[PDB]
Amino acid sequence: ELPNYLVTLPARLNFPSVQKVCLDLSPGYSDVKFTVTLETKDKTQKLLEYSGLKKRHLHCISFLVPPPAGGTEEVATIRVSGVGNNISFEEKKKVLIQRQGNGTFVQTDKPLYTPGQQVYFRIVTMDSNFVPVNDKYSMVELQDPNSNRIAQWLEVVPEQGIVDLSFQLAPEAMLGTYTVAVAEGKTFGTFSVEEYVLPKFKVEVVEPKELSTVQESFLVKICCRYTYGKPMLGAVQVSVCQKANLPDKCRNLSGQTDKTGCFSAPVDMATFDLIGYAYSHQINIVATVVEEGTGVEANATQNIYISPQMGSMTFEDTSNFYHPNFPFSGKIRVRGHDDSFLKNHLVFLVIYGTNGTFNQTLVTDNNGLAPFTLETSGWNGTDVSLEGKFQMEDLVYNPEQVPRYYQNAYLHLRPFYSTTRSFLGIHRLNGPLKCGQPQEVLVDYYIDPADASPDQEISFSYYLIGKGSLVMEGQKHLNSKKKGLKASFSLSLTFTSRLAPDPSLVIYAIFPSGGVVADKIQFSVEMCFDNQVSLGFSPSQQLPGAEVELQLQAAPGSLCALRAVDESVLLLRPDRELSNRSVYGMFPFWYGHYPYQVAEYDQCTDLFSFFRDVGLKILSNAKIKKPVDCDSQVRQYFPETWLWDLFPIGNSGKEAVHVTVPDAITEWKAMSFCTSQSRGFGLSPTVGLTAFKPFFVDLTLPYSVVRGESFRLTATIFNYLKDCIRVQTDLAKSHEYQLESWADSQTSSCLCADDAKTHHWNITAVKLGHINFTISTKILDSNEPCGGQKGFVPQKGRSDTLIKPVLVKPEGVLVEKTHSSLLCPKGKVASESVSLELPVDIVPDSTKAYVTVLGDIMGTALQNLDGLVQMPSGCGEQNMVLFAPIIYVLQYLEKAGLLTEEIRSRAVGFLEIGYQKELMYKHSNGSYSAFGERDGNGNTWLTAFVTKCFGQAQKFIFIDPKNIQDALKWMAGNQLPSGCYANVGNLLHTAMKGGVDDEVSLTAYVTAALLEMGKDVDDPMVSQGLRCLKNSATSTTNLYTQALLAYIFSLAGEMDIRNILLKQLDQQAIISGESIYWSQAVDVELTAYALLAQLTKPSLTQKEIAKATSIVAWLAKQHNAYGGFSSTQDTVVALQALAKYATTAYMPSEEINLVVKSTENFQRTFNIQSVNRLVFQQDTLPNVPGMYTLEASGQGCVYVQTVLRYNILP
Ligand SMILES: *[C@@H]1O[C@H](CO)[C@@H](O[C@@H]2O[C@H](CO)[C@@H](O)[C@H](O)[C@H]2NC(C)=O)[C@H](O)[C@H]1NC(C)=O
Ligand SMILES: *[C@@H]1O[C@H](CO)[C@@H](O[C@@H]2O[C@H](CO)[C@@H](O)[C@H](O)[C@H]2NC(C)=O)[C@H](O)[C@H]1NC(C)=O
Ligand SMILES: *[C@@H]1O[C@H](CO)[C@@H](O)[C@H](O)[C@H]1NC(C)=O
C-alpha cells in the first residue's frame, strides 16, 4: 500500500574497527535505487547501493569508517537517497566518528619486592573488541617514590600486542611506592619496595558475613589455614567493635583453635547499641592469630555493615513496557534479610493506574522466583506502576524496636506506541548466559488479520546488538495465511566477545499500512573472551623439587603470557586485579544512548526509543517516532615468582610444557593471558598448585638483623603423617654466626600426628651481608616406643634440609653526609673537587658512598603542566584560579626549550576564551570583582592579582591597555601614605585564601604587583607603599611577611636593607638532605618567594647558585602545588621562581660528557644526551673515602650529588 524503507547504522563510529550498515525494504519499489552515503568533511563515500524487490529483504554489509577530520572526533552526516520515476527520497542524520580509546594495562610479577630483586612488567594495549594492537609506545618510564626517573625505554615495540620489560633494582634501593608509567599518559602501575618476610598462613572471617538487626546473637568463626591447606593451633584474639560518628563498645574474644583450625564464639546484640542515631551501623571484626611456639602473628579485618533490611524483592526479569490489550509477563526475585532464597514466600502485587488499584497474591518457588502474568485489557494505554510487597498494610516501624524494613519492588510501565493491534513478546533467558553456546530464543507473536494483508508474505526483522554496534541480523519470513492466532517461532543466537555483557535484541515487523510492531529486550551474558584459554596443572599437587605438566589451551597462533606467583606474596599485598571484570571495565559503560554531539531532541516508548536505548541511528519514513506534546633433598629455592614467561601457541591450540616446582611448601597461584590477532584476547582463571611435603622444617627469622646483637631463631617442624614419629633435628654450624650453647644444635623429639613443634635458638650475627642458615631433620629409628607405639618411618622423603638467607646490616646509628654541586660548563670544562672525610670511630664495613648525576631539574610533572591547561572554566572563581598558571607555565617552558607549537596554539586559544570571560567580572568602579559588579569597593588582593596576571599576559595574546591604567589609578585612590592595604574583599573558596595574607603582606604583595611589568621605583603609587613598608621591615614580624619583604626590597634596586633580614631567614631554614626549605601549601609559597628573592640581584656567586639549586631540589619534589589547580596562587609563584631560576643560571642538559676521578684513578664516565637527561643516574664509589674530582664538558648543566652513609656508635 505505502512502500517504505528503514536504514540502521550505529551512533558512535570507531575508527580502528569495521561497522555494519543495514537496509530493510518493502513490497513495491523495484525501480527506485536506494543508496546510502556517509558525508564526512573531506570526502563522501557511498555505503551500499541497492534496488527494491517484490518482497521485503534485509540487505546488509560491513564497511570501514573514514577517519575523523579533527584527528579524534568529527560529526559526520549519513544520507539515504532513492531516485527513480521522477521521485527522490532523501533523508540525512548525524553520526559521530571518534577515535576510540585503546585500553592499556600493565602488570608486574609481584606487587611487592625486597631491595635487590628484579621487576618484570608486561604492558598490553587493546581495542574495544579486545583485539591487540602493535602501536609504538613513545616512552616507558619507571620512577622512584621521590618521582625520579630511574629507568626509561624509548620507542619500544610490542610483539603480538604485549611487551615485557625488566629492571634490576639496586640492593640499596630506597623503599616506597615505585611507578611504571606508559606512553606519557594516565596508564600507570605501582609496586611497593619494602622490607618483609613471607607469611605462612592466612586468617579469615568465616561465619559473620552479613548481619541483621533482627537477630539476637551471631556466631563468630575465625578460621586460619596455612598456605598449603593444613590447619594449626594458635591463640586467637578477636575484637568485635562498634564505632561512632565517645567511647566505642567492643567485645573481646580469646580462644584456641581445634583440629579444624577454626574458632567459634557467640556475640550478643546487648554489647552494641544498634538503636543510636549518633552511632554507626558498621561493625569491625579484627582478629589476630599468634600461632604457638614461634610467636608470629597475622591479622584479619572485616568491616560488616549490619543490615536493617528485613526482606528485599526487585523485578528481576520484567520488561519496562507493556503492549495494550495483550497479557504482560514478568518474574520477581525475592530475597530475605541475608539475601537468601526464600522458601515459598507470600508475595503481594499491587498495580497503580487510572482504572484503579488491583491486587494479586502469589507464592514463589524454591529459588525465590515469582512468575506473574497480568491482563492489560483495561489499562487503555496509560502509564501504570507495579509494586511488589510483603503485606497489604503500609509498614509500621517502631523507634523503640530495632530498625527493620522491607524493600518493596517498584516499577513504572509505559504503553508501547501502538498504531496497530498486533503483538510481539520475547521470552527472556533467565540468568547469566553462557558465552559461545547457541541459545534458542522463543518469541511469541500475534498478527492482526485486518492488518495482515494475507496475499503477501509477512517478515520479521531482528537485530542482535552488542556494545552499540550491529552484531548479527536477520529477517524471518512467514506466510500471512495463518491470519490471527497466538503463535511462536524461534531464533538461534550466539553470544561472543563482540556482544556486550548486557546486549540487546530488537525484533520488529512492518505492515504495508505503515505500522510497526516491535519488542526489544536486554540479555545478560558473562564477561567473555573469544580466545578461550584454560591453564592447568597435572597432577595439580606434587612434592617440591619435582616436575608438573603445565597446559595452555588457547586459540592457535596466540602468544600466551604466564605468571605463577607464591600465595605468600599475595597475603602481604593484594596484587592489582587482572580479571575479566577489570578488562571489560576499562572500556567504560557501553553505548547506552546517542552522544550529545549528535543527539536528537523534540523541537517544542516506540521503535525510535528502542534504537535510542541501544545507541543506533534509524532512518525510516514509517510510523516510528511517536508524536510528542510538550632419601633426602636440599630445599634451596626462589619463593617469590616461579614462572614469568611468554609461550607461542601452535596450530593445535594446546601447549604442554614441564615446569619444576620450587622448594617452598606453599601454594602457587598461576594465571595466564593470551593474545591472538585473529581471535583477540583471552584470560585464564587463576589456578593453584599446592607444593606440599609430609613432614618438613620452617624457619622463623626476621628480614634484617643488625650485626652483633642476639636474635631469636625459631625452627618449627611440621608433621602431617597420620601417626606419631620421632624426629632428630640439627642446625648447621658455620663461621657466619655464633650460638649461645643451646644444646649443641642436636635434639631428638617424639612428635605425633598433625602436629608442629618449635625449637628455639638465640644467635649472634658476625659477618655482614646475606648469610645462610641450614637446618635438617631426619626420622631416626626408635629404640623404645614413644606414646605407646613404635615411631613410624616412611619410605620416601625421610630427611628434609632447608637453607634460608638472612640480610645482616652494620650496627650503630646511620649518619649520612650529602654534598651537592651544579657542574655547568658553557663551552669549557667545569671541574670541582669533593672530599669524603669521616671520623675514625666507625664500625668497619659501613662506609657506602655513591655519586649521582642528573641532567634535568624535576621529574615527570613537566608533562603534568600540559594537563593544567584543560577543563575550561567561566563561572565563579573557577576561571581566575586557572587563567593565572597558564602564562607562567609557558614562561617556564619557553625559557627551558620544551615549548612546542601545538600546546602553544591550544594554550593561546585557552587564553582567548578565558580573556573574554574576565570582562563581565569587571567591577563598575573600574576594578575587578569575583561576583562581577557586586562586592562593594574593589578588592585590593584581586585587583593586585589581575594586574600581576595581565602585566605578563600581553606577550602571548592581545590585552587591552585601559584596565591597567584605571586599576593603577584605583591603587592610587585606595592607598594613602598614612593608610595602606584596606582589604574590602574575600575569596569565594573556603579554608584557603592564598598565603597567610595579613595587612603587611597584602601591602607588600600589592607593591610587588605594581612594578616588574613596565614600572620602576619612585612612582607616586609605590612611594606611599614603600613609606608604609620601610618601618614594616623594622618590626621583623612573621615569616611570610619577612620573605615577601626580602623579595620586595630585592626589586627596589637596593642591596643594603634586603640582605640584613636574609641573615635571620637562612638560619631558620629547616634542612632535609641537600634540599633546604621553610615552613611557617604555605611552605611552597615561602620557598618560592625566597627563591624569587635570592635570584634577583645581578651579581651572582656560585654559593648563591648552590643555594638556589638547594631550593629548586625541594621545589622539584612538589607535584600537588603545581600540576593541579587546588591552590589559587601557589602555582604561579612556584612557576615564576622556577622560570627566573632557569633564566639566571640553569639551562638544562643537551650534551654533557662527565668524568669522575679518584686517588686510585677510578675513571667513571657519564654521558648525558637530551633524550636521557631526566634519567637519574648514579654509581657507587669503590675507593676508600678521600678526594674525588668532578669534571664535565659540553653544553648544559648537570646536578651531581655525592652521598656518603656510614654507621657510628653513640
Ligand atoms: C588504537 O590503535 C589503533 C591501531 O593501530 C590506532 O589506529 C591507527 O591510527 C593511526 C593514526 O595516525 C593510523 O595512521 C593507523 O593507520 C591506524 N591503524 C589501524 C590498524 O587502524 C588508533 O589510533 C589507536 N587509538 C588510540 C586512541 O591510541
Ligand atoms: C648459601 O650458600 C650457597 C652456596 O654457596 C649460595 O649459592 C647458591 O648455590 C647453589 C649451588 O648450585 C645455587 O643453586 C643457588 O641458586 C645459589 N643461591 C643463590 C644464587 O641465591 C647462596 O647464595 C648462599 N646464600 C646467601 C649468600 O644468602
Ligand atoms: C595487625 O594489627 C595490629 C593492630 O593495628 C598492628 O599493630 C600489626 O602491625 C598488624 N600486623 C600485620 C602483619 O599487619
Ligand SMILES: *[C@@H]1O[C@H](CO)[C@@H](O)[C@H](O)[C@H]1NC(C)=O
Ligand atoms: C568472568 O566474570 C564473570 C562475572 O562477571 C564470572 O563468571 C567469572 O569471573 C568470569 N568467567 C569467565 C568464564 O571468564
Ligand SMILES: *[C@@H]1O[C@H](CO)[C@@H](O)[C@H](O)[C@H]1NC(C)=O
Ligand atoms: C639465650 O639462650 C640461653 C639458652 O637457653 C638463655 O639462657 C638466655 O636467656 C637467652 N637469652 C635471651 C636474651 O633470650
